Amino acid sequence: AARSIAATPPKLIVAISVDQFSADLFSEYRQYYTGGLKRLTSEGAVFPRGYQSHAATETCPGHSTILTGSRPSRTGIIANNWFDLDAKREDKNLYCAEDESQPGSSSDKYEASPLHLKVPTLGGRMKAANPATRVVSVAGKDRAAIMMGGATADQVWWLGGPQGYVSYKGVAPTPLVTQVNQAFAQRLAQPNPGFELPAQCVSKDFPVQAGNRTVGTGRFARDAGDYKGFRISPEQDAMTLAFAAAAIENMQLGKQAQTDIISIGLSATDYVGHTFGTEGTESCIQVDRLDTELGAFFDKLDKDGIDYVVVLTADHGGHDLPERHRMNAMPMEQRVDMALTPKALNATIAEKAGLPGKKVIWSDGPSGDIYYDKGLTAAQRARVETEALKYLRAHPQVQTVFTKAEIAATPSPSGPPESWSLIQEARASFYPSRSGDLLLLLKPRVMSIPEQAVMGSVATHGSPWDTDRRVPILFWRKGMQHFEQPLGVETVDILPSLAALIKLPVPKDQIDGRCLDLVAGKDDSCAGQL
Ligand SMILES: [Ca+2]
Ligand SMILES: [Zn+2]
Ligand SMILES: [Zn+2]
């Protein structure tokens, strides 16, 4: 039966982040969905040009926007890792989702924590308005689960390894979690024969060499006990969705008086895209499995009779590896110069600044935030800035370099995210106590993974360009009226759009997003405070 998505408050909010599910990838395969993604695109409110609008198009900044209504400039989550050169501990690199105050910690051996997140999540705001609210977050990555759930979440679980799903220190598995992990262990202990190709994947079945690796033809065959293989496959998304459905039923989410919320971070698409690039059989199979498993998941919830509303989006977009782009009509695609990577860049800048052999800058990839060493004198700091700017601006693969002061002086951006300037994008993931002294941006179609004889990941996101910012945002509730809205919107718009449905006020001055009307035609779901 036809029924407005705003007719009454939904009893359950289901928020799904598909890691690296770019609008490019989503759109390419849109015509082949038959399951859960067909349900959302054919019946839902469809924003195919959503934006993780900031420059720092990584997993942690992206997840911090989805259920906070807040850009990274406000969440404080400006990268997966940032330096705190004043940190007490020896490792000045901080992980986005750790508590570095813990003794004996490092960015390699950390204690998971939402402490770095400066704002509440939607579940936190629902819980402040009504303590009976349950707030649940499950993902294949701790940072996804943590940043979507927020500090007051009831249950936060993520895939921790071959042991299965785990939570914060001190949190023992419930009977449900042990059952889930027993099921997980049994699946892992069985070989997976892999997947024959869906029709749409047959055309993608050709090998591409990158350094010592060959990609393009994988079908997720894997040995028993091969956890790496399990992690980089549709298998972990199936597990995470099963875990979510069981949690929903076991906790009776959506079946009480108040509205509950569960966030789900489906990580496989990202591992797959990193390891193989995005246009081969591996991503193609993964996206088709995603559609199927989402369909099974929505069918279970429907069978349970739950009145739920869904939002599905991504934490960032993605970009294919250069070697395949060059085969497919993009011959200018290329990998970043090894000279721009951290060790080589620091050695170059230190030398030009008259300080050869010294540590003068800190960085953790060939783009993004660069920090001056705190042990520089003011004069030395000034030479280092001058030489860094001079050298990077003259490099043929560099688009531009912003100083901290230039970004700071930029007003928080407004207006259509699809036509922002680069510095507006930078401003949207600028947070003074955590951001670098310089922000390095590479030219379009330069992949920030240099060519090497021995390589790992062949492709990544993290650039300020459209492939990496643009993501779908899909909303759905049984019986609603579908519409398509192709103009740009931001993932920070998601929180106020859901809050309106449950009549939760959200002070406009505490968030960056705006309410999106999810009611096609005359009536307006946002009518009210938002
Ligand atoms: Ca309307
Ligand atoms: Zn991600
Ligand atoms: Zn990634």
Side-chain angles (χ1 to χ4, degrees):
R3 174 73 148 176
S4 172
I5 185 168
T8 58
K11 295 324 282 302
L12 179 59
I13 298 173
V14 177
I16 300 170
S17 181
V18 188
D19 203 318
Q20 209 189 121
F21 190 43
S22 68
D24 284 347
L25 184 62
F26 156 85
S27 295
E28 175 174 354
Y29 291 118
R30 195 162 165 185
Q31 73 198 75
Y32 312 104
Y33 306 151
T34 62
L37 286 166
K38 172 176 182 190
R39 165 185 312 215
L40 306 180
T41 60
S42 69
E43 291 175 19
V46 178
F47 302 84
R49 308 193 69 81
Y51 280 88
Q52 290 276 0
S53 53
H54 50 277
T57 50
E58 296 184 332
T59 294
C60 225
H63 279 96
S64 82
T65 73
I66 295 177
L67 293 185
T68 63
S70 300
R71 303 183 186 135
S73 58
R74 191 187 304 263
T75 68
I77 306 301
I78 48 114
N80 290 340
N81 293 270
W82 54 91
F83 290 103
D84 180 352
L85 295 186
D86 293 316
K88 175 183 194 174
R89 78 185 190 181
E90 118 88 61
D91 184 5
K92 315 301 174 172
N93 184 87
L94 306 190
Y95 179 54
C96 60
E98 73 167 304
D99 174 1
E100 72 278 8
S101 77
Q102 298 309 324
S105 56
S106 68
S107 57
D108 282 346
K109 174 176 184 144
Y110 59 87
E111 290 290 9
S113 170
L115 199 62
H116 290 156
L117 174 61
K118 302 314 290 201
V119 299
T121 59
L122 171 55
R125 290 176 171 281
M126 291 162 72
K127 204 176 255 299
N130 190 346
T133 309
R134 282 78 61 77
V135 177
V136 173
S137 189
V138 302
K141 297 183 181 178
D142 54 8
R143 50 192 178 262
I146 290 165
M147 296 297 166
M148 292 197 285
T152 61
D154 298 285
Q155 299 285 347
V156 181
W157 295 88
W158 60 84
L159 193 53
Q163 71 273 35
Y165 293 85
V166 298
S167 189
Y168 302 115
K169 195 176 180 204
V171 172
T174 55
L176 180 79
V177 181
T178 81
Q179 298 180 12
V180 168
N181 288 340
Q182 289 172 4
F184 168 71
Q186 281 152 359
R187 293 185 194 195
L188 180 57
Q190 263 227 316
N192 191 327
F195 293 100
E196 183 53 73
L197 303 180
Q200 64 271 25
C201 304
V202 170
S203 53
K204 308 319 199 84
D205 189 15
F206 61 89
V208 176
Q209 289 181 358
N212 63 322
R213 294 196 52 221
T214 301
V215 306
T217 66
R219 287 185 197 192
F220 303 111
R222 80 161 163 83
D223 294 17
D226 176 14
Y227 178 65
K228 175 161 169 163
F230 183 99
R231 177 178 44 94
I232 305 173
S233 80
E235 293 191 69
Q236 72 151 293
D237 282 358
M239 211 53 227
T240 295
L241 281 174
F243 184 7
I248 286 168
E249 182 183 339
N250 166 275
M251 295 178 69
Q252 291 289 102
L253 304 184
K255 293 292 195 66
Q256 299 186 343
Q258 78 291 332
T259 301
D260 299 311
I261 184 175
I262 179 166
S263 39
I264 306 171
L266 300 177
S267 313
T269 302
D270 183 67
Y271 290 112
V272 168
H274 283 297
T275 299
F276 302 109
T278 66
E279 303 289 3
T281 59
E282 307 92 341
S283 289
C284 185
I285 291 170
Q286 156 60 12
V287 166
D288 176 78
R289 290 311 305 175
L290 175 63
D291 173 50
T292 291
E293 299 293 349
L294 284 173
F297 170 88
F298 295 145
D299 286 342
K300 179 52 175 47
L301 296 201
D302 292 353
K303 184 195 182 67
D304 294 346
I306 301 174
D307 177 12
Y308 62 101
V309 55
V310 186
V311 59
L312 184 148
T313 184
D315 54 343
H316 49 77
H319 202 108
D320 194 23
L321 78 165
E323 291 76 1
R324 182 161 45 217
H325 268 311
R326 290 199 295 267
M327 299 177 173
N328 287 1
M330 290 293 153
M332 73 295 288
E333 277 265 330
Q334 65 194 250
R335 298 184 171 280
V336 66
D337 184 356
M338 182 75 73
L340 295 181
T341 59
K343 180 177 180 289
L345 185 60
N346 170 81
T348 295
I349 301 307
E351 200 155 88
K352 323 214 77 150
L355 307 170
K358 301 181 187 67
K359 184 56 161 171
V360 299
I361 54 165
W362 296 71
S363 60
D364 68 335
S367 71
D369 296 278
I370 300 174
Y371 305 75
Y372 301 142
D373 189 86
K374 294 316 199 190
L376 292 169
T377 70
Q380 289 167 344
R381 183 163 165 123
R383 305 200 308 269
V384 166
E385 177 149 296
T386 297
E387 301 295 330
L389 292 172
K390 176 174 171 186
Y391 173 80
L392 292 168
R393 284 165 179 171
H395 192 283
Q397 289 175 323
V398 172
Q399 178 73 26
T400 190
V401 186
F402 296 137
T403 61
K404 201 180 200 193
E406 291 173 330
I407 304 162
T410 300
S412 185
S414 64
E418 63 271 41
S419 47
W420 286 1
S421 66
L422 291 177
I423 197 160
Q424 284 174 320
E425 295 184 16
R427 169 63 177 80
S429 45
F430 176 78
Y431 189 83
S433 61
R434 295 167 180 179
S435 291
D437 295 303
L438 300 173
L439 194 75
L440 172 58
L441 300 184
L442 307 175
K443 287 184 177 165
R445 308 183 181 181
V446 178
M447 177 71 63
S448 61
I449 297 161
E451 165 162 279
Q452 295 179 279
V454 177
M455 277 177 64
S457 295
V458 294
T460 192
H461 41 99
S463 88
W465 302 106
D466 200 62
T467 62
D468 295 348
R469 293 170 80 226
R470 204 177 86 258
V471 297
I473 302 165
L474 316 173
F475 298 85
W476 180 93
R477 191 179 179 185
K478 182 185 198 157
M480 75 179 287
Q481 179 163 9
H482 159 77
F483 67 101
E484 180 118 348
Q485 174 48 260
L487 301 181
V489 292
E490 305 181 65
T491 50
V492 290
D493 299 336
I494 287 167
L495 180 150
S497 308
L498 297 169
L501 299 188
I502 54 166
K503 312 286 157 159
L504 173 67
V506 174
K508 301 189 159 176
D509 74 351
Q510 297 169 9
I511 58 166
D512 302 290
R514 71 185 180 83
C515 189
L516 306 180
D517 180 8
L518 303 177
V519 175
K522 294 197 176 306
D523 291 336
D524 186 344
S525 61
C526 297
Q529 181 256 334
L530 292 171

